[PDB]
Structure formats: C-alpha cells, structure tokens
Amino acid sequence: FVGLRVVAKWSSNGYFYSGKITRDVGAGKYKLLFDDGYECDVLGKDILLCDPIPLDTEVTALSEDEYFSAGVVKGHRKESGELYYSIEKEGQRKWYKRMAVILSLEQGNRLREQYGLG
Amino acid sequence: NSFVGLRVVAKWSSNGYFYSGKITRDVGAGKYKLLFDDGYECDVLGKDILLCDPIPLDTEVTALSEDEYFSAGVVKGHRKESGELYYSIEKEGQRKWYKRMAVILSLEQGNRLREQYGLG
Ligand SMILES: CN1CCN(c2ccnc(C(=O)N3CCC[C@H](C(=O)Nc4cccc(-c5ccc6c(c5)C(=O)NC6)c4)C3)c2)CC1
Ligand SMILES: CN1CCN(c2ccnc(C(=O)N3CCC[C@H](C(=O)Nc4cccc(-c5ccc6c(c5)C(=O)NC6)c4)C3)c2)CC1
C-alpha cells in the first residue's frame, strides 16, 4: 500500500484526513504523510483506501472563519491539477478544495468495511 | 460569589481544546452551562473553566491562521481597536496579530493555567 493516497485517522482527534502512505512500519501500522505536512503512524484499520473521497459520502466541509458543517459529496472536479468537491447541504451545493474536506470519526467508520485496510 | 455571566476560557469535551465563551447557568454540583463565542453550547465542569478574559500575557496559546494552518505561540500583547480585541502572538522571535476567534488553548496549554485561573 506504500505510495497510495488514502484518508486516514489522525490519532489525537478521531478525524480522518487525506494523505499518502510513505512506509510500512510493521506491527499493522503505516507511516502517513498528510496533505497538510503532518506525519504519524496509523493502524491499517484507520486507513481508508479512497482517492478521491467517493460520491454520496457524508463528509465535514470546512469554510472561512473556522466554520464547518456536515454535507454529502455529489461531485468531483479537476482544475489546474487540483481536486475539488461539490458538497450538498440543504438542497444546495458548494465547491470545496481537497484541504477543506475531512471526515468525523462516525463518517470515517461508515467507509471502514468497504475501504479500510486492516 | 457566582461565576455566571463571566467571560472565561473553557474546555470543549470532544477535543481537549479550551475556547473563549461565557458561563450562562450554574447547573449544580460544580458543572456550568457554557455559551461559546462560536455559538456552541454544552455543560462544563468548574475544574475545566479558566477565569480569564483576555487570555493573560506570557500565556502559551494556539494561534489560528487562514487555510486551517495553526501553531503554538506566546501572548506578548493585547490591543483594543474599533472596540475589538487583538492578541500579539510571538513565535520564534517574531510577532503577529490575531483576533479573539483565532486564539485557543490546547489541552496541555489550558492545564498549565488550571491552578492559577481554574474554578473548581
Ligand atoms: C467551542 N467550539 C470549538 C470548536 N468546536 C469543534 C467541534 C467539533 N470538532 C472540532 C474540531 O476540532 N474540528 C472540526 C473543524 C476542523 C478541525 C480541523 O481538523 N482543523 C484543521 C487544522 C489544520 C489542518 C486541517 C486539515 C484539513 C484538511 C486536510 C488536512 C488537514 C490534511 O492533512 N488533509 C486534508 C484541519 C477539527 C471543533 C465546536 C465548539
Ligand atoms: C493531518 N493533520 C490534521 C490536522 N491536525 C490536527 C492536530 C491537532 N489539533 C487539530 C485540531 O483539531 N484543532 C487545531 C486547529 C484548530 C481546531 C479548531 O478548534 N477549530 C475550530 C473550529 C470551529 C470553531 C473554532 C473556534 C476558534 C476560536 C474560538 C471559538 C471557536 C470559540 O468558541 N471561542 C474562541 C475552532 C482544532 C488538528 C494535524 C494533523
């Protein structure tokens, strides 16, 4: 799974963030380089093998002035080599960059069976 | 004397971080109802509430920038401008200004103020 882009749990807070597996560190763990530059060891069970976050996934969308809310991925777009998510909330859609989309513990848990490593 | 109506820095249970808000109710036995400056509300134990507004000078804090970037820094100034509070935060010998909604405390940072500023 080394070099693959994933969505993984940051241990200290239960949230799942996009990043890449850089190394297999053994004991069921892998080194992760997160898209924000942070690094840590994550257990295979806490790594979802999906890039991009799939359509119809319930996510946490991050706005300006630290505001965040739940919504559903209804689109993917590529623009100048960057990924954007079209997130639906109360029948309307807004575009969010890859760095503005995360999963809560419960939202991530929902993808474990189909996308988890373990 | 009651702490109800006072502006504080309180722990949000789900992540260990401390945020500015106001105590709205004494819900008995050392717990209080909190209205946070972002509009969120919950019950917080007195021991997890810091009685300080503004966050004092020389406090180690977590400063929030744009595009979700955050870092540790030390409060070296307080400024009132157009009726609003700003914190001058020092990081590796340089200072930047942050609004009240861009300054929080981690679990360890808030724990350090419990003995001097905590309620319970
Ligand atoms: C008093 N109030 C206090 C606040 N409060 C919370 C209630 C529940 N949860 C929280 C919380 O705590 N969070 C949710 C909002 C986003 C927070 C985050 O996670 N910030 C961040 C900060 C820095 C970076 C990246 C980031 C992004 C996207 C990506 C990456 C990296 C990355 O590596 N790949 C993709 C995100 C977490 C607050 C309500 C009550
Ligand atoms: C892969 N990466 C993923 C990200 N990652 C983390 C490592 C440690 N911690 C976090 C984290 O999770 N947080 C830190 C950054 C701010 C996050 C927050 O707390 N966001 C927020 C969201 C919404 C509102 C208010 C807010 C503000 C100020 C105030 C109030 C309300 C308020 O009520 N009074 C004052 C803040 C929490 C990420 C590093 C590794």
Side-chain angles (χ1 to χ4, degrees), chain A residues 10 12-44 46-56:
Chain A
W10 176 255
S12 83
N13 68 180
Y15 287 99
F16 288 86
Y17 304 87
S18 57
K20 314 161 179 296
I21 297 165
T22 56
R23 198 158 68 92
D24 186 321
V25 300
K29 264 166 166 167
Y30 304 78
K31 196 157 278 288
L32 242 101
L33 174 64
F34 288 92
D35 291 343
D36 65 358
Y38 281 69
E39 288 192 277
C40 78
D41 291 348
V42 187
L43 282 154
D46 298 332
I47 296 159
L48 302 159
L49 193 56
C50 55
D51 181 38
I53 292 153
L55 298 165
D56 293 319

Side-chain angles (χ1 to χ4, degrees), chain A residues 38 62 66 68 99-100, chain B residues 14 40 64-65 68 70 101-102:
Chain A
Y38 281 69
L62 310 189
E66 294 86 56
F68 67 98
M99 296 302 291
Chain B
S14 84
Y40 279 69
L64 311 187
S65 293
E68 290 90 55
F70 68 98
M101 290 303 292

Side-chain angles (χ1 to χ4, degrees), chain B residues 26-33 43-44:
Chain B
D26 182 329
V27 296
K31 245 158 40 207
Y32 295 93
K33 202 167 282 165
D43 288 355
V44 184

